[PDB]
Amino acid sequence: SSPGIWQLDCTHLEGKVILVAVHVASGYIEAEVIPAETGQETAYFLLKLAGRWPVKTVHTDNGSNFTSTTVKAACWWAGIKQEDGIPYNPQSQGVIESMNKELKKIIGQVRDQAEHLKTAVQMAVFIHNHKRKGYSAGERIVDIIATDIQ
Amino acid sequence: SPGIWQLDCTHLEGKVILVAVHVASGYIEAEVIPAETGQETAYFLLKLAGRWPVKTVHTDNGSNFTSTTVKAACWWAGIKQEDGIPYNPQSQGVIESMNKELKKIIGQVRDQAEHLKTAVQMAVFIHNHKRKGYSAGERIVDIIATDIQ
Ligand SMILES: NCc1ccccc1-n1cccn1
Numbered sequence A: 001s002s003p004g005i006w007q008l009d010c011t012h013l014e015g016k017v018i019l020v021a022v023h024v025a026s027g028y029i030e031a032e033v034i035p036a037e038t039g040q041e042t043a044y045f046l047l048k049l050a051g052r053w054p055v056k057t058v059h060t061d062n063g064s065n066f067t068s069t070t071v072k073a074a075c076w077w078a079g080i081k082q083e084d085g086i087p088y089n090p091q092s093q094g095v096i097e098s099m100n101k102e103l104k105k106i107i108g109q110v111r112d113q114a115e116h117l118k119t120a121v122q123m124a125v126f127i128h129n130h131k132r133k134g135y136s137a138g139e140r141i142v143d144i145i146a147t148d149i150q
Numbered sequence B: 001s002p003g004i005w006q007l008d009c010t011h012l013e014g015k016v017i018l019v020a021v022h023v024a025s026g027y028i029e030a031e032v033i034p035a036e037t038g039q040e041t042a043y044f045l046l047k048l049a050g051r052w053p054v055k056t057v058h059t060d061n062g063s064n065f066t067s068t069t070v071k072a073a074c075w076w077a078g079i080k081q082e083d084g085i086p087y088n089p090q091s092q093g094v095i096e097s098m099n100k101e102l103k104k105i106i107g108q109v110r111d112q113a114e115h116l117k118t119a120v121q122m123a124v125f126i127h128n129h130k131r132k133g134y135s136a137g138e139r140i141v142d143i144i145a146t147d148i149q
């Protein structure tokens, strides 16, 4: 069920890890910088995400988080069906790779306005979610979920 | 108005919980920080505005209203920074009640969370999903979609 499906994506920059959740139907994202991708960090990130949007399904980004006791506990807590993230559809991989490159591009564009990477990454989530493509991802996610409520 | 949010700062366990409340829906986002500083408040608003279409923020106190760093984040993110004076007195009573509701929920999830920050996000989840028959999560999405269309 499309309005509730999200994909986790973990990318690296400046020796740090950027954890992203993409709402697959809209391209809307939330993202955080963490020191490393552990079960505990992923779990807490999912808890935050599910408190903010109606997360029904998550495609986890790798098998360590799919396996992780802590990730499973957060998904049980927040009512999330944890799935694998295998691109049975191959164009999925490319879409995510392209967002990572686009996100890193926006990060380079603001990187000097931000003393800390975390700032630059939240600036990048803002520019990504507001970019008009004519609707933005922030507009599409709202539209998709509102249609689903009604 | 679909773009109006209120900042709210409450204390528990010697730590600070910063809350943004979407006024029309009651939907919230919240974070634990060591201390309410301009830099923390700025970063929190930047995150909030990248996630929801934040047009106006009622700041929670005059230090954040004044803060250069808060004004810079509001300029960067396109937010009109306002004072949070309850020109309607029922506004402050609504925030007090939510801080008490939030603290209650945090109490109820204390067996389950080792760190306060986990309990606070559990409390955000339960607050936003609570049916009152729509939830706050439902109302904000409905409000903002009506706005877009
Ligand atoms: N809808 C959530 C959202 C999130 C991020 C950025 C923008 C938005 N948006 C909605 C209407 C207009 N922008």
Ligand SMILES: NCc1ccccc1-n1cccn1
Pocket (backbone or CB within 6 Å): A050, A051, A052, A053, A054, A145, A149, B128, B129, B135, B136, B137, B138, B141
């Ligand atoms: N809409 C954002 C949201 C956030 C938190 C909890 C629930 C929701 N929601 C929307 C539709 C159904 N639940």
